[PDB]
């Protein structure tokens, strides 16, 4: 497959190789704050990252993934809309060429400059590959980024990017604490959806935090020096690696907060 975010292989083309692109539970979506309803059935959300073990950072040609040891329950998400335990496998971001776009979810049609996705898989299915085949297989914690003050906890990521400029490059990335990327409040919206990149599988419980984090212009400008291309190939800046909002269809977005 040769999908991407270019002039000829972008999101509008994905359906040809991945027909589920036009499915009933595709992500991302626009979150209409005046239709989303507070849900008192939601249990407390628990983000348990104290024992997180990051390992490596990889430029995969469509974003970079910070990868974790998910061989045991070291960093998990539980509670909220979730039943059981979801293990952190990786995080990554989506960002724009300019600050006025970049996020995948939108809030009353507002686009943020970027969006962070912490991806977790349901341990009841044993491994990630099995989990993506199930409607309750993944939980993705989505966090909006706006440009303002620097995010201190992000700078260790920013500073390694020069070492993974091109597709296929990776670097050791141990001892990174994902708690440093959270906002103050864990208020969220939740709905059932999908992966936002091919294969677009409809396996995700989305938990999208209401409070954005702030990063500095200098930090985002470093993300925009990454490359989609491999070493020595014509330079294609890694920008605008976001899928636009997809139809909500029958779905309901629930708020954790009154
Ligand atoms: Zn993502």
197 known ligand binder: yes
* Residue 122 region by backbone torsions, left for phi larger than 0, else alpha for psi between -120 and 50, else beta: beta
Closest CA to 94 of 73, 111, 70, 71: 111
For residue 38, the CA-to-ligand 1 centroid distance in Å is: 25
Structural domain spans, the chain: 1-258
The span from the CA of 72 to the CA of 238, in Å, is 33
Residue 26 structure tokens: 């595709």
Note whether 251 and 240 are within 8 A (CB): no
Pairing state between β 170-172 and 204-209 = unpaired
**Is 120 marked active-site?**
no
Cα separation, 93 vs 62, in Å, equals 10
User: From the CB of residue 30, how many other CB atoms can be counted at a distance below 10 Å?
Assistant: 19
* Domain covering 1-258: architecture: Roll (3.10)
- Which one, of 33, 16, 11, 22, lies nearest residue 249 by Cα? 22
Experimental method: X-ray
Which one of 2, 8, 13, 62 is the catalytic residue? 62
Cis bond before residue 199 (omega within 30° of 0): yes
Residue 196 annotated in ligand binding:
yes
Distance between CA atoms of 131 and 185, rounded to whole angstroms? 29
Q: Which residue reads 């686009």 in tokens? A: 111
DSSP classification of residue 100: T
Residues 211, 187 contacting (CB under 8 angstroms): yes
Please name which of 189, 31, 185 lies closest in space to residue 111, comparing C-alpha atoms. 31
Of 210, 87, 85, the C-alpha closest to 142 is 210
Reported structure resolution in angstroms: 1.6
Distance CA 52, CA 102 (A): 27
């Amino acid at each position: 497959h040769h999908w991407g975010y270019g002039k000829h292989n972008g999101p509008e083309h994905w359906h040809k190789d991945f027909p589920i692109a036009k499915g009933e539970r595709q992500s991302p979506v626009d979150i209409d704050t005046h239709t989303a309803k507070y849900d008192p059935s939601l249990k407390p959300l628990s983000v348990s990252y104290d024992q997180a073990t990051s390992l490596r950072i990889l430029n995969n040609g469509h974003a970079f993934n910070v990868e974790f040891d998910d061989s045991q329950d070291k960093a998990v998400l539980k509670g909220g809309p979730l039943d059981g335990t979801y293990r952190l496998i990786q995080f990554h971001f989506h960002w724009g060429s300019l600050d006025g776009q970049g996020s995948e979810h939108t809030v009353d049609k507002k686009k943020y400059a970027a969006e962070l996705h912490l991806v977790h898989w349901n341990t009841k299915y044993g491994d990630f590959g099995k989990a993506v085949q199930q409607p309750d297989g993944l939980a993705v914690l989505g966090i909006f980024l706006k440009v303002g003050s620097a995010k201190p906890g992000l700078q260790k990521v920013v500073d390694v990017l020069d070492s993974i400029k091109t597709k296929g490059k990776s670097a050791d990335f141990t001892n990174f604490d994902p708690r440093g990327l959270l906002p103050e409040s864990l208020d969220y919206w939740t709905y059932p959806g999908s992966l936002t990149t091919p294969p677009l599988l409809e396996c995700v419980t989305w938990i999208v935090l209401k409070e954005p984090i702030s990063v500095s212009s200098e930090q985002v400008l470093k993300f925009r020096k990454l490359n989609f291309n491999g070493e020595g190939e014509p330079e294609e800046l890694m920008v605008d690696n976001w899928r636009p909002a997809q139809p909500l269809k029958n779905r309901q977005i629930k708020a954790s907060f009154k």
